[PDB]
Design a protein around this ligand. Sequence first.
Ligand code: CDL
Ligand code: PEE
Ligand code: PEE
Ligand code: CA
Ligand code: CA
Ligand code: CA
Ligand code: CA
Ligand code: CA
Lengths: 246, 246, 265, 265, 265, 265, 265
Amino acid sequence: MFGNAFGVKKRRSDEAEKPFWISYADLMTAMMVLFLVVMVASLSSVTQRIQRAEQGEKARGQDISRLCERLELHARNVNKNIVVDCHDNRISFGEAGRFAHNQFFLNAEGQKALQDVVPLVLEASNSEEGKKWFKQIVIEGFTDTDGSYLYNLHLSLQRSEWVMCSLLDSRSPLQKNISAEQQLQIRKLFLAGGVSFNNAKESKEASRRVELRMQFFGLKDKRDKADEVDFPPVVNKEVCQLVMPL
Amino acid sequence: MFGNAFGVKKRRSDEAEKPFWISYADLMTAMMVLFLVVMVASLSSVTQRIQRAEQGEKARGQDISRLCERLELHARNVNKNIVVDCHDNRISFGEAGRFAHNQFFLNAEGQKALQDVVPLVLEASNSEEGKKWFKQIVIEGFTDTDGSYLYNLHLSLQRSEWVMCSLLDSRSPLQKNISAEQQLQIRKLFLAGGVSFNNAKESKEASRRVELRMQFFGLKDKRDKADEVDFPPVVNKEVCQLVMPL
Amino acid sequence: MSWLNSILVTLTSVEPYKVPVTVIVTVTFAFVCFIFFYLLRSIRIIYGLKKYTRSINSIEKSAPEVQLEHLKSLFQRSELKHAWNEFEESLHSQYELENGEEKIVRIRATAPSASFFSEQQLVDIPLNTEFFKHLPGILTGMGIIGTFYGLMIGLNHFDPSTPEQVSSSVNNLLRDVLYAFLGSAFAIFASILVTWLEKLSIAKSYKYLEKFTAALDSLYDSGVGEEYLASLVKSSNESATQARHLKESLVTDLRDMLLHLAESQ
Amino acid sequence: MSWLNSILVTLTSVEPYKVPVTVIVTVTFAFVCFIFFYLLRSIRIIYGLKKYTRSINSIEKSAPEVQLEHLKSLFQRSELKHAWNEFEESLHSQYELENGEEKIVRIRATAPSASFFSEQQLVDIPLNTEFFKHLPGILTGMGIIGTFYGLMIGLNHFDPSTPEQVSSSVNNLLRDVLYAFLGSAFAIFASILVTWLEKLSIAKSYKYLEKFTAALDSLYDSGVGEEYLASLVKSSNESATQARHLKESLVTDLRDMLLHLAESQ
Amino acid sequence: MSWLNSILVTLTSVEPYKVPVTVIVTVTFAFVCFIFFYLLRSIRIIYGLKKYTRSINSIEKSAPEVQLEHLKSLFQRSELKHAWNEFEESLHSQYELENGEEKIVRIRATAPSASFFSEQQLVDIPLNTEFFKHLPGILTGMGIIGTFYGLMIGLNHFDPSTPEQVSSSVNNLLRDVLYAFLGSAFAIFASILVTWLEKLSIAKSYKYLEKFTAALDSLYDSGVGEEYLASLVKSSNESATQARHLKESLVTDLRDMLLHLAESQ
Amino acid sequence: MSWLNSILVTLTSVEPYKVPVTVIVTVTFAFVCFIFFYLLRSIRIIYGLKKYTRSINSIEKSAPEVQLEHLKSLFQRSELKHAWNEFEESLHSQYELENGEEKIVRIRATAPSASFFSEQQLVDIPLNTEFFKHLPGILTGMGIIGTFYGLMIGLNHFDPSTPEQVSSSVNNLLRDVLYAFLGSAFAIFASILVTWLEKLSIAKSYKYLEKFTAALDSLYDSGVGEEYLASLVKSSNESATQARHLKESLVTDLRDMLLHLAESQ
Amino acid sequence: MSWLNSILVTLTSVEPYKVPVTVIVTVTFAFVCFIFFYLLRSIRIIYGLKKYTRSINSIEKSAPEVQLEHLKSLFQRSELKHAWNEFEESLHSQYELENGEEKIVRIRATAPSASFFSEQQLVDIPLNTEFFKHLPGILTGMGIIGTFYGLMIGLNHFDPSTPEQVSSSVNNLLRDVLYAFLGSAFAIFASILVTWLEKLSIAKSYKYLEKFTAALDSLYDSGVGEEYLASLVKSSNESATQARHLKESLVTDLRDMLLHLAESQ
Ligand SMILES: CCCCCCCCCCCCCCCCCC(=O)OC[C@H](COP(=O)([O-])OCC(O)COP(=O)([O-])OC[C@@H](COC(=O)CCCCCCCCCCCCCCCCC)OC(=O)CCCCCCCCCCCCCCCCC)OC(=O)CCCCCCCCCCCCCCCCC
Ligand SMILES: CCCCCCCC/C=C\CCCCCCCC(=O)OC[C@H](COP(=O)(O)OCCN)OC(=O)CCCCCCC/C=C\CCCCCCCC
Ligand SMILES: CCCCCCCC/C=C\CCCCCCCC(=O)OC[C@H](COP(=O)(O)OCCN)OC(=O)CCCCCCC/C=C\CCCCCCCC
Ligand SMILES: [Ca+2]
Ligand SMILES: [Ca+2]
Ligand SMILES: [Ca+2]
Ligand SMILES: [Ca+2]
Ligand SMILES: [Ca+2]
C-alpha cells in the first residue's frame, strides 16, 4: 500500500574462483614437477658412471675413426692399390695380395703397396692419436679346412715370414728410403704370426691373401709403460732366411 | 508510494560452481601420481639392470676362475711340471719349456707335458664353463731381443709349427689316442698366434720359451654358426712339414 | 577388508577402452539432453519473443479497446496467457462520459510488464536454468571420474617385480590413463561448449524478453496514481473556493429577492 | 618434536584399506542423509504442490466466500497455513449493501501470492538448501582428504633401504595410491550425483510452486486501489457540479416560495 | 640476486617438523576463533530466537496494548531493540472513540516483520558471515603454504652427488613430502569441518528467524490502506445522496414554515 | 573396439610440438574474441555513460521543460530511448495556473532512475557478462587438456629398456614436458590476464553507471504523494473550520438583514 | 615448427632467478595496490561511518530544522552527499501554523535510510569490490605461471652432451623447482592475506554502515501515509455528521427568526 519504491536491490555479484582449487592445482603441478625432476636427477646419478664410460667409448671410437680416415685418405692420395677398411680396422691388398697355390711370394704391385703403406701407417701412428691409441700391428694369416692341416699351416707361416722379410730385408727398396729410427719403429710395431679359418667368403681363392689388421688399447689399458721393451741398434743388415729361388 | 510492502523477495539464483580449476587440480593430481609411480618404477628398473649386468660380469668371472682352478688341479694330478697362472689365464712350462740356440723341439719332458695337457684342455672345454665361455687357444712364442731379428722370428715360428705337429702328427701319440670328434675339437680349439720378444732380467734360458694361453667369451659376445668353422672328417693322415735333418 | 579388495578387482577388471566409451556416451547423452531441453527451447523462446514484439509494435497506434483485444488474442501459451491476464489486471482503464456512456479513453500502467512477463516465468522455468547451469560441472566431474578410473585400472595391474614387468606395467598404465583421458578431454570440451551455448542463449533470451516487455510497456503510460492525487488536491482547493463563492451568491440572491418582496408589498 | 613424530606414527599406522573405507562410508552416509532430508522431502513438497494446485483449480468458478472457505480448509501445513493467513490478510474484500446487509461481492488481490507462498518459506527452508547446496563441495573435500592421507601412508611405507625389497615397497605404494584414488573417485561420483539430484529437484520445486502461485493468483483481480482513487476523483468533480446545481435549485425554490407568499399577501 | 639466495638459505634452514606444527597450531587457532565468534554465537542467536518465538506466541490472544507493552519489554538487544522500534513504527494503530477517549481497538501491519528483523541484521552481521564464509579457503591456503615450504626444505636437502646416495636421498625427500602433506591434510580436514558447521548453522539460523518473523506477522493484520480507500469511496458516494436529501428536507421545512407564517398572517 | 583402437593409435602418434601450438592458437583466438566482444565494447559503454552524465549535469540548473526536451533529445537516438521514455513516465509534472496557462513549475520523481537504466540492460547483456565471467575457466580447461595430453605423450615415449639409453630418454622426456608446460603457461597467463581486464572493466562500468543513474536522480525530488496526502488532510480540517465560520457568518448576515427589514417595515 | 622454437628461445633466454623475483615483485605490487586502493580506503570509510553515527546520535533531541541543517553540513563526500540529498527528499516534513508561519513540527520517514546510504553506493563501488574480490585468484595464478615459466627455463637449457653438463643441468633444474616452490608459497601467502584483510574489512564496513543507517532511521518515524488516510476517513465521516448537524441548526435558527419577525409584525 505504502511500500518504498526506492528500495535498492544489491546487484547479482559474480562469485570468485574458490582459492582452494587454484592453490591445489598449483600444489599438484609443483608435486608433478618435483617428482619429474627428482627422477631426472636420480637417473642421471645412478647412470653417471655408465654415462662417463659411454662418453669415453664414443670419444675413443671417434679418435680411432679419425685416424683411420686420415690413413685411408693418405693411401688414396699416394697409392690406389692400398684400400683401408675403417669398419673393422683392416688394410687389404686384394688384387695385389693374391697367392697362387703352394707359393709364398707376391707380385711387384704387392711389394710396392706394402713398402708404400708401411711408412704411411708409421707416420699415422707417430701422431698424437697414434701415440695415444695405436698398438702394434698384427699380420693376418688365412688357411682352408681342406687337405692336410699342417701343409696349410706351413704355407701361412711361410707367407708371414716372407711378408716380414720383405719389410725388413737388405737391398729392399724400403731400406733405401728409410732411417734408423723408422727401422726401429718398424721392428717395434710389427710382429709376424697368426692363423685363422673362416667361411664368410664364397671362394677358396680369397683365403690366399695377406692382410694387415691394427688393434688399439682398451679403455682401461691407457698404454701401460711396462709392456714396452727396447731393442739394440742395428749393427748388421737383416737377411731373410727363406728360400727365394725355391 | 503506490507499491506494496509485501512483495516477492529472494530474487537471487545460485551461481554454479566454476568447474575448470577443479578439473585442472584433479587431472594434475592424476599426473602427479603418474610421475611419482614412473619415478619409483624407473629407479627400481634401472638399478636392477645395473645390478644384473654387474652380477653377470661377476658370475662369468667366477666361472672362468673355477674352470682355471679345476684345470690346474687336473694338471697337477697328471704331472707336476705344469705351471698354470689363473691371474692372466695362461699355462706355462717352468723348466721343460726352455730352448737352446738353433733349437726348435722340446725335450722329452716337454713333449710329454704337451701331450698330457691336451686331454685336460678337451675336458675343460667339454665342461659347462667351456661351453659357456671358452674361446680358441692361441700359441705365443718368446725369444731374446739379441741376434738376428728374422732368425729369432723364424726359430719361434718353427717351434710353433713343431708344437702344432706334435699336437696333430699321426705318428704322435695324440692322434692314435684321440678319436675323430676329439681331433675335430682340437682343430677348432688350438690356433697359432704371434711371436713376442718380452726379454727381461737378461735370462736367455727363460726368454726363449713357448706357452699356451686361453681366451674367453665376453658377456656381450654372441655365439653364431658363422664363427663355428667345422673341419671336415679326417680323410687322410697328416705328416709334419719340417723334416729331421733341418 | 576382503570386500574392498573384491570391489576393487571387480572395478579394475573392466576393459580399459570401456572407460572412455562410457564417459563419452554419458557426456554425449547429457549434451543431447542439453540441446533438446535447453538450447532448442531457448531458440524457440527467442524467436517467439521476437514475433510477439513485432505483433505488439503493430498496434501502437490502435485504439485502446482494439489493442486490448489484439493482445488478448495474441497470448495463448499457458505461461504467457497467465502473464497477460495478470498484467491486464494491473492495467487501469480510464473511463470518460461520451454520448451518455462510459467508455475507455486511455489505459494506464500501474506496474511494468516485466513484473508479470518475468525472466523466471518466461525463461528460467521453461529452460530449467536452475538445473542446467550446473551441467558443465557435472560433465567435468564425469571426466575426472573417468581419468581416475583409468588410473586405478593401471595401478591395480602394475607388476613391479622385474624390470621387464616394470616396463610393461608402465606402458599398460599409461595406455589405460590415455584411454581414460580421451574420455575426460571429451568431457571437458563438452563442458566448454555447453558453457558457451548456455550463457549466450540465456543472455539473448533475456535481451529479447526485455525487448518484448519494452514493447508492452510502451503501450501504456504509468503515473496515474500521482495524477489522481494531484486532481484530488486541486478539487479540494477549488471546493473551498466554490463554497465561499456560492455562499456569497446565495446572500446576494436573498438580498435581491427580499428587495423585490419589499417593493411588491 | 616427539609429539609430531607420535602423531605421524599414529596416522600412518592405520591399515591402508581403512582410508577408502572411511571415505566411502562417510560419503554414503552424507548421500543417505541427502536422500532422506532433501530428495524425499522435495518430492513430497512437489506432490503436495501439485495436489494443492489441482484443488485451487477446482474452485475457479465458485463464489468468493465459498472459495475463501475452501482455501482456508485446504491449507493446514504450518508454513502453508501461515502463508494462507498472511495472503488472506492481503486480499481485499469489496462489500455491497444487499438486502439490508453487507455481503462480499468480490475479493481483490493487493499482492502477488508468491510474496507469501515464497520459494524461501515453502522450499528453501524445509529443504535446508542453505546447507545442502554446499554438500557436493564437502564430499569432494572428503575425497581430497582421503587422497592426501592415502598418499601420506604410501610415502611412509616407501622406505626400502635395500635393493632386494624395492619391489615390495613399490607394490605397497601402488596399493595405497589405488586406495586413495578409489576413495576420491567415489567421493566425486557421489558429489556429481548429489548435484544432479538436488538441482533437478530444486528446479522442479520452483516450477510447481510457480504453478501453485499462478493458480492462486488467477482467483482474484488486482488494481482495486487505482479504481478507488479514480472513484474519488470522479466524486470530487461531481461534488463541485452537485454543489452548484443544488445552490441554483435552492435559489429557484426560494423564488417560488416567496412569490407564493406575495400572492397570499 | 644474492638476496634471493640468502632468503632461500634462511627459509630452508628450519627443521622440517616445525612446518606441520606451525600449520596445525595456526589452523587450530582459526578453528577455535570460528567456534567462539561464529558457532557459539549462532547457537546463542538460535536459542534466543526460539525463546522470543515462544514469548510472542503466548500473547497471540492478548489485547493490542498488552501485546505492544509485552513486545516492547521483551526486545532488549541493540539490534532487536532497534528492529522492534522500526517495526512498531510500521504498525498502524486504529483509534475509536470509546468512553469519550481515543482508544486503540486494533493494530494493523503495513510491512512484513522480516523487513525489520532481517537476516542481515540478525544473523549475517552478528555472525560476520561476510568474513566467515571465506574462512575454509583461508585454512586450505595456510595448509598449502605449509606444504610448499616443507617441499622447499625437502628439495633443498635433496642432493645425491653419488650414485650410492640416490636411494637414501629419495627416501629422505619422500619423508619431507610426507611432513608437508601432513600439514595440508590437517588444514583441508579442518576446512571441511568448518564448512559443514557453518552451513548448518546458517540453515538453522534462517529457519528459526523465519519462525520468529512468522510469529510476529501473525499478531497483526495487513491491508488497512485499501480498507481506508474503500471507506472514503463509500463516504463520497453517500455524501452526494446526503447533500441531495438535506437540500430536499430543507426545502420541505422551508415550505412548512412559510405556510405556517402565511396562516398566522 | 576397432574404432577406439584406431582413435588411440592416431592420438598416440601426435607429434608433441603440435599440442602447444594448438593451445596457443585457440587461446589467442579466445583472447581476441575477449578483446573485441568484451573489452572494447565495455570501453565504449564507459565512454557513453560518461558523455551522458556530462550532458545530464549540464542542464542541472535549467527550466524543467528545457530539461525534458534536452534529455529526450539526448536519449531519443540511442538504445536508451525506451528506458528514458519509461523514466519520464515515472516523472510527475506539477502544474500551476500562471498567466491563465497551465505550466510545469516542478517535476517530481516517483522512482529511482536505476529501475529503468539497469545494469543488466546497460552493461551485462551488451557485454555478455554471463559468458565472459566463465572465459578464464575455459582457458584453464584448454590448458589442462593440452598439458595433460603432452605429458601423456612424453611419458609414453619415455621407455628406457637399457641403462645406456637413459640419457636420451631423459632428454626427449624433458623436451616433451617443455612443450606441455608451454601450453599450460600460455593458457593460464591468458586466463589471469583476462580475469584482471574484465574484472577491472566491469568495476569501472558499474561505477560510471552509478554516476549516470545518480545524475538522473539528482534532477527531480521525490515524495510528492505524501505532500498530496498532507494537503488533502489539511483541506478536510480547514473545510470543517470553513463550514463552521460560513454558517456563523450567514447567521449574522441574516440577523442584520432581518433587523433592517423590520426597521423598513 | 621454427616459430615454436623461436618463441621458446626468446622466453627461456631470461635468467632463472628473474622468474621468482618477478613473481615476488608483481605479487607485492598487487598487494600494495590492494592496501592503497582497498584497505586504507575501507578504514577511512569505516572511521567516517563511526564518526557520522556519533554525530547523528548527538542530535537525537534536537529540533527538526536543527537536525536537518546538522545532517546537511555533515555529509560532504560525493556519494554521501548524494545519498543524503535523496534520503532527505524521501523525508516528509509535517507543517503546522504556529502561529502565522509554517513551522516544521515533525519529520517523517517514508523509506529506510539504507535505500540511499546503501552498501553498493557507500562501500562496494568506492572499494571496487567487483574487482578486488577476484584478486587472490589472480595472485595464485601468477604463482602457477611462475612455476611453469621457471620450469620451461630449466627444461629448455638442459644439456645432455657431457656428464658434467648433465650435472649442471640437473642442479639448475633443482634450483628452478625450488624457485617455483618459493614463488608459489609467496603468492598463496599473499592471496590468503589479501582474502583475510578484504573480507574482514567488508564485514566491518557492512556492520558499521548498518549501525549508521540504524542511527539515521532512529531519528524519523514511518507510517505517516496510513495516518493521513485514517485522518481523511475520520474527516469524511465527521463531515457527513456535521452537515446534518449544521442543517438542523440552520433550520432551527430560521424558524426562530421567522417567529421573531411574525411577533414584531
Ligand atoms: C582460429 C580458430 C582457433 C580457435 C577455435 C576454437 C575456439 C574455442 C574458444 C572458446 C571460447 C571463445 C569464444 C568467445 C566468444 C564468444 C562471445 C559471445 O558471447 O558471443 C559473441 C557473439 C554473439 O554476441 P553479440 O556480439 O551480442 O552478437 C550480436 C549478433 O550478431 C546479433 O545480436 P543479437 O543479440 O540480436 O543476436 C541474436 C542471437 C540469437 O540467437 C540465438 O538463439 C543465440 C543463442 C543460441 C545460439 C545458437 C548457435 C549455436 C551454434 C552451434 C555451434 C556452431 C559452431 C561451434 C563452434 C565450436 C565447434 C568446434 O544470435 C546470436 O547472438 C548467435 C550468434 C552466435 C553464433 C556463432 C556463429 C557460429 C560460429 C562462428 C563462425 C566464425 C568462425 C570462428 C571459429 C569457428 C570455431 C572453430 O557470438 C559470436 O560471434 C561467437 C563466435 C565466436 C567463436 C565461437 C567459437 C565457439 C566457442 C565454443 C568452444 C568450443 C569447445 C570445443 C568443442 C568440442 C566439443 C566436443
Ligand atoms: C580447439 C581445442 C582447444 C584446446 C586444444 C587442446 C590440445 C589438444 C590437441 C591437438 C593436437 C594437434 C592437432 C593436429 C594438427 C595437424 C594437421 C596436419 O597438418 O596434418 C594432418 C594429418 C597428417 O599428418 P600426420 O599423419 O598426423 O603425421 C604424423 C607424423 N608424426 O592427418 C589428418 O588429416 C588429421 C589427423 C589428426 C591428428 C590429431 C588429432 C587430435 C584431435 C583432437 C584433440 C583432443 C584432445 C587430445 C586428448 C588425447 C587423449 C587420448
Ligand atoms: C612482469 C609481468 C606482469 C604479469 C605477470 C604474471 C605472472 C608472473 C610470472 C612469471 C615469469 C616472468 C618472466 C621473467 C621476466 C624478466 C624480464 C627481463 O629481465 O628481460 C631482460 C632480457 C634478458 O636480459 P639480459 O640481462 O641481457 O640476459 C642475459 C642472460 N645470460 O631481455 C629483454 O630485454 C626482454 C626479453 C623478453 C622475455 C619474455 C617474457 C615475458 C615477460 C612478462 C610476462 C610473463 C607471462 C608468462 C606467460 C608464459 C607464456 C607461455
Ligand atoms: Ca509505458
Ligand atoms: Ca489475479
Ligand atoms: Ca499478519
Ligand atoms: Ca532526486
Ligand atoms: Ca525510524
